[PDB]
From a paper:
Proliferating Cell Nuclear Antigen (PCNA)—the eukaryotic sliding clamp—is an 86-kDa homotrimeric ring with a six-fold pseudosymmetric rotation axis running through the centre of the clamp and a central channel lined with lysine and arginine-rich α-helices through which DNA is threaded (1–6). The front face of the PCNA ring contains the site of interaction of polymerases and other proteins, named the PIP-box binding site. The PCNA–associated factor p15PAF (hereafter named p15) is an oncogenic, 11 kDa intrinsically disordered protein that regulates DNA replication and lesion bypass via a PIP-box interaction with PCNA. p15 co-localizes with PCNA in the nucleus of proliferating cells mainly in the S phase of the cell cycle. Thus, p15 outcompetes DNA for a common binding site in the clamp channel, and the stoichiometry of binding dictates the available sliding surfaces.
The electron density map showed three p15 fragments spanning residues 50–72 in the corresponding PIP-box sites, with a conformation analogous to that observed in the co-structure with the p1550–77 peptide.
Residue numbers in the entry:
A (entry chain D): 51 to 71
B (entry chain E): 51 to 72
C (entry chain F): 50 to 72
D (entry chain B), E (entry chain C), F (entry chain A): 1 to 255
Amino acid sequence: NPVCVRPTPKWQKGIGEFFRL
Amino acid sequence: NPVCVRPTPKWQKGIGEFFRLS
Amino acid sequence: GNPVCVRPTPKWQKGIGEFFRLS
Amino acid sequence: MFEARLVQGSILKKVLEALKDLINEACWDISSSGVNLQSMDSSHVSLVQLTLRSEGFDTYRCDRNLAMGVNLTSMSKILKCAGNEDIITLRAEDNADTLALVFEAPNQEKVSDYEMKLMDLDVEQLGIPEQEYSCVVKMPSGEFARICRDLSHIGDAVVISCAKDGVKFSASGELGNGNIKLSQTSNVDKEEEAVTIEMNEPVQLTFALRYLNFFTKATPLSSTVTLSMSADVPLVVEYKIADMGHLKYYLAPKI
Amino acid sequence: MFEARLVQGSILKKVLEALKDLINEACWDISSSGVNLQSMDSSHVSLVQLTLRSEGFDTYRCDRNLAMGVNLTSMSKILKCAGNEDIITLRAEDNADTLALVFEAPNQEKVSDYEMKLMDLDVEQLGIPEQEYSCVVKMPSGEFARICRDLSHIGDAVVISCAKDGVKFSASGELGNGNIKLSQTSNVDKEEEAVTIEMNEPVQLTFALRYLNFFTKATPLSSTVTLSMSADVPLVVEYKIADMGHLKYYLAPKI
Amino acid sequence: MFEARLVQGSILKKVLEALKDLINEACWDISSSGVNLQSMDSSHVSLVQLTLRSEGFDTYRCDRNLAMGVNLTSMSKILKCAGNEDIITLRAEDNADTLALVFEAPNQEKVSDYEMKLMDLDVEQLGIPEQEYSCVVKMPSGEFARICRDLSHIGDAVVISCAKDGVKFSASGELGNGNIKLSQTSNVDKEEEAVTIEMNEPVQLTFALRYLNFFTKATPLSSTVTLSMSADVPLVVEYKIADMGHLKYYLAPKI
């Protein structure tokens, strides 16, 4: 079976919200 | 040499015409 | 896994017509 | 409730891939004798009959007769998840709209459970007359797929001409002609290799190659196939499911 | 000059296969200890960090620290010409806005070499804290790759549950539901095949299958993968490279 | 009456695969000497010439010189109805509107005969200067095809430089620059593996990789291939169909 490429979920939060410069 | 998808010929009869529903 | 990027013809390409004559 | 465990799960998968192309929605008849599908194609042209008899399963339990409405694409999608060696078990409630599939690895390390929805559907049955065929060709499945695939390229329809000392497949179209001539030979040692013609009369029939090409999608169920023929009578393309049951395909010929 | 000569070219190929569909442009931080990359993906969702330690090359010479802005797509394109057994050298010139790649075959009679345009790029760098995670699953890479792929037919997110028993991958959608139960395999030596749960506490988090599925493009880099998790902390999906370093992706859960 | 029986039927499929893509149609000129075909590509750039000498057939009879107007796709389509393993007979009667091919298996159990409709072609010959060439390189066919593949990633055109020690393929464009260096080999083993160059004078010439990539579709016809160039003179890429003839493609360099 091949990847059925899904949408980015609406709840998805960016990595820059847990990691600081 | 892959399948070439032919269309259904103007003469094709349905299997309906050979068996009894139901 | 490399395919062939199939390319355009250079504007500079001359046809084999111009290098061989009709029999 | 119903529960069917099948060691060669592969078999369900092969079946669906064969099927999905022909029709999207089919109604599955579960009774204690086995699993049964019968449905026309979405065009209303050919007729497909699937029988998976209960003794083919390591475990079959059926209390009440059930009619699950299945969308074949979904069931295919869910099926693909199943590993090749995986053991598939089908389980379902009675009077309840859901189907459950369990997939067990051979290593015994992992186990997957999918709960597919069923659907509302009513399908007309046709009554298949059992009857007597002037010609019956038994040949390799592979070879049949190839022949159609190739005449596919020549023309719309194949004429299958059955005669005692072999069968001939032929087409005509813009490119030209083609006649493929397979000699009857009973000689060979493995018997899936054979061509065989239990004939009572010669027969020459013209079939749509659009549809034979849909049927040869069951090809990887069986190394052999059987064409039963008669003049003005639906061909029966039949793929034996390893002593569990059959996949059979019905298709009317010209006139 | 920077000159770095890796016997196992394939590593480099594999690495760029992994990131190419994730990051358009990246900064390759070369120093004497080795090569590190850190970048968010295009959509600023996941984060990728690469470490190939100098110890891990047959030859590694670094005159000075370097910050090479490379269009990954184009770097990938060049590595694709690279043969698998190929010995690959990466060479850089101090003045240059030019990355040279050199592929030599085991054939020893053909030698390819390319040059690519480096660009000036701004490096913003997220600090990633050292940590201890509630669960840390060690499974084989392929299995994970399959699991994410199959579930992606089922719905848009996966759920990963751990206890000490095993780990359950689940999803659900318009189609139906899936639960995939890996039971633990630590006791067997199982160097490749084994599943290990170093749980310090249970966890139950929800990840976007879309992004896990990009991450699984690293699969060919290593026979195993590791998922480190804890609530509301992002996931570390880690692929070792053999003694050389690792490729970790970071990805945030629901809420 | 023309009739030629070719044990290695595969030769005839291979030729077509190579040509269908470059040539829509072409006159196959038949003489007792053999089958010879010459034609320019649909876009009038390159010249392909094919030669199957009678000597090379297990049966050959031409009575009368006929020129057969053939749609290479249509002929490809039909040849794909023949097994690799199959023996292939071509029949054609005088002033035919049709050419007939026959395919016989390892068992002769299956016999296929097709009739491909011909066409009329207003095509007149081009005279081919016999020449001595500045440089003649000979090398694996695959290795050539690989080079013209890899460098097609790099840019529109390839630069072939010829020297006594080795020959060198280079390209460039938006991506960057690349060079492939093939040194000549001492060997002796193996001939297939070999590279060998014949330098009268050195060459440095430039050609489209669009067309080279088209030509290397002849690759399965021979495990080695043969480049013949001189400055300002049209290149000859040559594949030898063993013990029969050759397929030569001729291509214009830059200015």
